[PDB]
Amino acid sequence: PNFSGNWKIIRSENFEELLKVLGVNVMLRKIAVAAASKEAVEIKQEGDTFYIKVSTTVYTTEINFKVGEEFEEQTVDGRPCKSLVKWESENKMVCEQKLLKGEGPKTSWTKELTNDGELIETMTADDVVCTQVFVRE
Ligand SMILES: *C/C=C(C)/C=C/C=C(C)/C=C/C1=C(C)CCCC1(C)C
């Protein structure tokens, strides 16, 4: 696989339900769904090392990791966490997150390159899975 690319979102599902689990109130949920509908993801993959840039209209974040090596990022609702990415197949990876402080829902994300050329990202909190689908710009 090669995840490298400038990816633009075409579909965004269940993001409000995810934010509901994470405690966000209704109006901020609606505004965040609108922001998530503009998500863009830039990936540079060098073997098992990933440089990712995730952005919306007013915000951008850089996430750099190596498969199998712990790193620090933040959960979807913004709490710092320790993360660990593993492959689950040739074209899909899964990240488990553990909070640095306090407690919360169990959170994770996945990234998958499909045979049709799409990038599928999911974000999970407990039983609620959000699915974002992207195509190359
Ligand atoms: C490989 C892809 C990764 C690690 C994607 C991470 C995405 C996020 C942490 C999502 C952030 C968003 C919000 C919290 C609300 C506004 C829009 C998003 C989708 C950028």
From Swiss-Prot:
InterPro entries: Calycin, Fatty_acid-bd, ILBP, Lipocln_cytosolic_FA-bd_dom. Induction: By retinoic acid. Pfam families: Lipocalin (PF00061). The keyword Membrane does not apply. Gene3D superfamilies: 2.40.128.20. GO terms for biological process: embryonic forelimb morphogenesis; epidermis development; fatty acid transport; positive regulation of collateral sprouting; regulation of DNA-templated transcription; retinoic acid metabolic process; signal transduction. Changing K20A: Loss of ligand-induced nuclear import. Sumoylated in response to retinoic acid binding, sumoylation is critical for dissociation from ER and subsequent nuclear translocation. All-trans-retinoate binds at Q132, V133, F134. There is a cross-link at K101 (Glycyl lysine isopeptide (Lys-Gly) (interchain with G-Cter in SUMO)). It is found in: Cytoplasm; Endoplasmic reticulum; Nucleus. SUPFAM superfamilies: Lipocalins. The keyword Ubl conjugation applies. A motif (Nuclear localization signal) lies at residues 20-30. GO terms for molecular function: cyclin binding; fatty acid binding; retinal binding; retinoic acid binding; retinoid binding; retinol binding. Keywords: Cytoplasm, Endoplasmic reticulum, Isopeptide bond, Nucleus, Retinol-binding, Transport, Ubl conjugation, Vitamin A. Coiled coil: none annotated. Transports retinoic acid to the nucleus. Regulates the access of retinoic acid to the nuclear retinoic acid receptors. Forms a beta-barrel structure that accommodates hydrophobic ligands in its interior. Interacts with RXR and RARA. Interacts with importin alpha. Belongs to the calycin superfamily. Fatty-acid binding protein (FABP) family. This is Cellular retinoic acid-binding protein 2. The gene is CRABP2.
